[PDB]
Amino acid sequence: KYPQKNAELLSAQYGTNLLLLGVSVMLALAAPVKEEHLLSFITVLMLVQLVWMLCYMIRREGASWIRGGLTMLALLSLIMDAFRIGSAALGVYPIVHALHTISQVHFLWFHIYETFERFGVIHAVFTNLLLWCNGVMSSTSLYYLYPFNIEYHIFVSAMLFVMWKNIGLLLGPLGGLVALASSVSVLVVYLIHLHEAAVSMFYYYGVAMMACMCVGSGTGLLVYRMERTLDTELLLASSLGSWLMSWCSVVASVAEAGQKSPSFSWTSLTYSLLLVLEKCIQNLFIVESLYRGRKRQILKNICMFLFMCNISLWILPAFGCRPQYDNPLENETFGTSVWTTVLNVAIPLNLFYRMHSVASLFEVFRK
Amino acid sequence: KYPQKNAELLSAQYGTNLLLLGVSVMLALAAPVKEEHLLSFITVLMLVQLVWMLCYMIRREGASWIRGGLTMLALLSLIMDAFRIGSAALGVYPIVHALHTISQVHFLWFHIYETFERFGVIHAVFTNLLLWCNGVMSSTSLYYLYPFNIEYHIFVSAMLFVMWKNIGLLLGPLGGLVALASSVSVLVVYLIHLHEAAVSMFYYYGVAMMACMCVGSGTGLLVYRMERTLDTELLLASSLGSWLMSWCSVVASVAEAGQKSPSFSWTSLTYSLLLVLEKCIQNLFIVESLYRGRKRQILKNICMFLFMCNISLWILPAFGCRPQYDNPLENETFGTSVWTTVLNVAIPLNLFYRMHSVASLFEVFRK
Ligand SMILES: CC(C)CCC[C@@H](C)[C@H]1CC[C@H]2[C@@H]3CC=C4C[C@@H](OC(=O)CCC(=O)O)CC[C@]4(C)[C@H]3CC[C@]12C
Ligand SMILES: CC(C)CCC[C@@H](C)[C@H]1CC[C@H]2[C@@H]3CC=C4C[C@@H](OC(=O)CCC(=O)O)CC[C@]4(C)[C@H]3CC[C@]12C
Ligand SMILES: CC(C)CCC[C@@H](C)[C@H]1CC[C@H]2[C@@H]3CC=C4C[C@@H](OC(=O)CCC(=O)O)CC[C@]4(C)[C@H]3CC[C@]12C
Ligand SMILES: CC(C)CCC[C@@H](C)[C@H]1CC[C@H]2[C@@H]3CC=C4C[C@@H](OC(=O)CCC(=O)O)CC[C@]4(C)[C@H]3CC[C@]12C
Ligand SMILES: CC(C)CCC[C@@H](C)[C@H]1CC[C@H]2[C@@H]3CC=C4C[C@@H](O)CC[C@]4(C)[C@H]3CC[C@]12C
Ligand SMILES: CC(C)CCC[C@@H](C)[C@H]1CC[C@H]2[C@@H]3CC=C4C[C@@H](O)CC[C@]4(C)[C@H]3CC[C@]12C
Ligand SMILES: Oc1ccc(-c2nnc3n2Cc2ccccc2OC3)cc1
Ligand SMILES: Oc1ccc(-c2nnc3n2Cc2ccccc2OC3)cc1
Ligand SMILES: Oc1ccc(-c2nnc3n2Cc2ccccc2OC3)cc1
Ligand SMILES: Oc1ccc(-c2nnc3n2Cc2ccccc2OC3)cc1
Ligand SMILES: Oc1ccc(-c2nnc3n2Cc2ccccc2OC3)cc1
Ligand SMILES: Oc1ccc(-c2nnc3n2Cc2ccccc2OC3)cc1
């Protein structure tokens, strides 16, 4: 029996104080508070969300890219758990976590207003946000699945928040197929030699692709000039992670350049600035396309090229080719813990952004 | 000659990469990058904003609470600068900063669309946000003015962002006057003895006032139940700082309680939880009032009481009574650098929130 304005503010205050409590626990942990205390806290929050989901289901009883999105990242998370399962907080957390993931997908697939529902969904938003934060701050198969569990817990947090926020074609695919074959070659050569040559190859390949995407998107923008809020916000919020990764690399490269060090190399400076520029241009192209016969064929070739390039760029870190963690300079300017966390944020965000863009470019291409 | 959607996204991307660059510099500094490099970076950004403001002015040539808000906090900032003025980056920064503050107030008072204006205002938003972040991370008069320069640089950042986001009465004043006289007594007694007794007095006084405000706001909510977006967002965003301060204190108090330490005291646990509860209740009361004869007199007495209590609570940290920095427990669980930064965020946010609430309660009272 609350006014809607009070139901929304009270739910927001509950959720934000839940986040700030998680923040307090994480700060206390890094500085009395042990890993078991943070795991126990989030485990309890998952148990609370599970109780809400069960009660909700009892009371109740072109999105294929999004449903297949979280179903794949949840299956990958369940695989990760299965590996971890096979202190009390460490022993219990993966069980509650697996149940949380299973119920979270079941609910979002089939059961996606009262104050009960608003508190439930806000709780879920900040539970998944805290799960992201924990995945980022805290056998060998757990390495490759790491970005997929983290992007699972940022995707689902967005999926839950935005739910209530609302409430001829020749050159394109040829360039795309070449970029994909080259990306696969870079991926396998890098993994086989897991060395320095493969890293340099990776960065030169990256620069070449980022420059080609800048040209493609710029051409599309010129065509539009001479002649959906959530998609823009999701592209920008996700790309911010990669823009921090890039600015950290740029700052470290400039700091090295200022000393006239013999180790300075343009491949760690031009690439990061190019990543920021290309993403700014692509974000503007994609949103312009979403707010909209030679021009049609040109735009289709551009979207097909960018689509394929974004898939190839998603593929690189998605399959284990993440050399940024081993950078000899960024791990000295910021240290290993800061560089590692910045990448732990940026990489799963970069995977999200590179598959978001692929879905938006696909839609633009079809129409 | 940009579409409005592209003008807004491109400006947002410029501003956010400006923030992420400032983030990169601050991380690099804490971990190659010295204080002079961060001061130089922000000094240059202030010079850029000054150039924009001059070009803009050349091209061009119930808000009294807000205009008097930033005019007072800018005069206090100029006083702080005057004290600092009387490495090259340290010598130059206060001059550019003073000019920035003077032009920022001149512009906001008298000169508060083209892409030029959008890039200019977004730059100013993230320049002031970076200035806040620097004031928080990095004679004796500089102590007392510290929260006012920091809240200046968070107030003005909000003032600039929201600009474009938009584009009978017996018991009340008697309780208020008693709360004010008691707050002044606590303030002067604390400062005179600048000791442990004054701190305990402060915390017991705080708890007594927070409980009285909870009763007042709860009564007002009951009256409304038995019978403006930016204001809600500013109250919540500002109160978040105090909710982090409170949860850090609560976590430290619980960690101490879990060890059965003889030093555990309820005054550091009940107060922080009460601060969170009272603010949640008051935020819901104020927004309910903004979205709206015995009931009228009751509501006027409640608003008058809360108005006076929020002034008294603003007065306590505003005049130097900030004992939270000396807490013997929160500075051990989180360390001195983390507890100090959490308070450097929360206190100027608490001052903002406690004068925001006073302006909203004043408006509600008059009508
Ligand atoms: C962007 C929104 C949605 C918030 C999500 C991220 C937060 C949960 C992040 C932001 C800043 C993070 C903190 C930033 C700073 C620190 C201090 C740092 O402390 C040290 O490592 C100090 C080491 C020493 O000197 O002993 C460790 C990480 C920690 C606790 C981080 C934990 C998680 C925080 C609160
Ligand atoms: C919301 C946007 C517009 C603001 C930009 C900043 C945020 C996106 C924050 C939230 C998550 C933060 C990161 C999360 C955690 C850390 C941990 C911290 O590293 C450590 O945990 C250990 C410190 C050490 O011992 O070196 C360094 C800061 C960093 C990378 C933070 C950098 C700033 C981030 C990206
Ligand atoms: C909320 C939005 C609007 C962003 C505004 C705040 C950011 C500018 C904050 C968020 C997290 C902050 C960082 C969090 C973590 C660190 C790591 C910390 O590093 C250490 O102290 C490690 C010490 C050591 O182990 O040697 C110092 C502060 C710093 C750089 C902070 C600098 C400023 C950051 C990026
Ligand atoms: C946007 C909301 C909903 C997310 C909640 C977190 C944010 C509000 C961030 C931005 C500013 C952050 C703070 C800014 C800086 C620091 C510095 C850091 O302390 C240090 O600088 C030194 C670390 C050490 O050596 O102990 C500890 C984290 C803390 C308090 C951060 C805690 C989390 C805050 C409040
Ligand atoms: C559209 C699909 C691909 C979505 C994401 C699924 C990902 C996580 C799957 C796809 C195929 C998998 C890879 C194929 C085989 C190898 C070689 C081995 O030595 C290390 C693991 C590794 C490298 C696997 C890791 C996980 C993997 C990358
Ligand atoms: C509405 C007004 C008050 C807005 C804010 C102005 C503030 C910053 C002004 C008001 C009066 C001032 C105080 C009055 C006198 C003293 C005693 C001296 O030993 C330390 C400084 C100190 C404690 C001053 C600090 C700054 C001050 C707190
Ligand atoms: O056949 C597939 C299906 C999905 C993915 C995938 N994996 N992660 C993500 N998606 C999809 C997605 C959809 C919308 C917005 C963002 C986003 O990014 C997350 C991969 C292969
Ligand atoms: O990989 C990503 C990263 C960020 C977003 C995103 N973009 N806008 C929003 N989020 C997420 C979010 C989550 C919890 C609370 C607030 C909040 O803010 C809304 C999406 C995908
Ligand atoms: O450099 C970055 C920048 C942003 C993130 C990030 N990822 N998810 C979230 N943010 C913060 C954010 C930014 C805009 C809107 C909402 C929101 O909240 C959730 C990470 C690294
Ligand atoms: O006579 C005065 C006038 C202003 C202040 C003051 N000082 N700081 C702040 N204000 C005012 C204010 C107004 C609207 C929203 C927030 C807010 O908070 C900032 C004090 C005495
Ligand atoms: O003391 C405060 C603290 C926060 C707010 C506030 N509330 N909502 C917003 N801000 C400020 C802001 C500043 C820069 C970029 C984005 C942004 O987000 C909007 C106000 C007063
Ligand atoms: O515990 C806290 C929580 C928040 C802040 C803070 N202060 N100013 C800003 N935030 C972050 C924020 C939160 C909501 C909307 C915008 C926004 O951005 C600016 C500080 C301490």
Curated annotation (Swiss-Prot), chains A, B:
Residues 30-34, 255-266, 320-337 are extracellular. It is a multi-pass membrane protein. InterPro entries: Otopetrin. It is found in: Cell membrane; Cell projection, Microvillus. It catalyses: H(+)(in) = H(+)(out). Disruption phenotype: Fishes display the backstroke phenotype. Mutant fish exhibit otolith agenesis without additional effects on the sensory epithelium or other inner ear structures. Otoliths are essential for the perception of gravity and acceleration. Larvae without otoliths are unable to orient dorsal side up and rest mostly on their side in contact with the ground. Pfam families: Otopetrin (PF03189). GO terms for biological process: cellular response to insulin stimulus; inner ear morphogenesis; negative regulation of type II interferon-mediated signaling pathway; otolith formation; otolith mineralization; proton transmembrane transport. Residues 362-367 are cytoplasmic. GO terms for cellular component: membrane; microvillus; plasma membrane. Activated by both acid and alkali, with proton influx in response to extracellular acid and proton efflux during alkali stimulation. Inhibited by Zn(2+); this inhibition is thought to be pH-sensitive. Currents evoked in response to mild acid (pH 6.0) stimulus may also be mildly potentiated by exposure to Zn(2+). Activated by NH(4)Cl. The chain crosses the membrane at residues 8-29, 35-58, 64-86, 88-112, 115-138, 140-165, 170-192, 197-222, 230-254, 267-287, 301-319, 338-361. Keywords: Biomineralization, Cell membrane, Cell projection, Hydrogen ion transport, Ion channel, Ion transport, Membrane, Transmembrane, Transmembrane helix, Transport. GO terms for molecular function: cholesterol binding; identical protein binding; proton channel activity. Residues involved in the gating by extracellular Zn (2+) and pH are located in the extracellular loops between transmembrane domain 5-6 and transmembrane domain 11-12. Belongs to the otopetrin family. Homodimer. Proton-selective ion channel. Biphasically modulated by acid and alkali, mediating proton influx and efflux in response to extracellular acid and base stimulation, respectively. May be involved in acid and base perception. Sensor for ammonium chloride (NH(4)Cl) in taste receptor cells. NH(4)Cl acts by increasing the intracellular pH, thereby generating a driving force for proton entry through OTOP1 channel. Plays a role in the regulation of Ca(2+) flux in response to purigenic (ATP, ADP and UDP) stimuli, leading to increase in cytosolic Ca(2+) due to influx of extracellular calcium. This is Proton channel OTOP1. It comes from Danio rerio (Zebrafish).
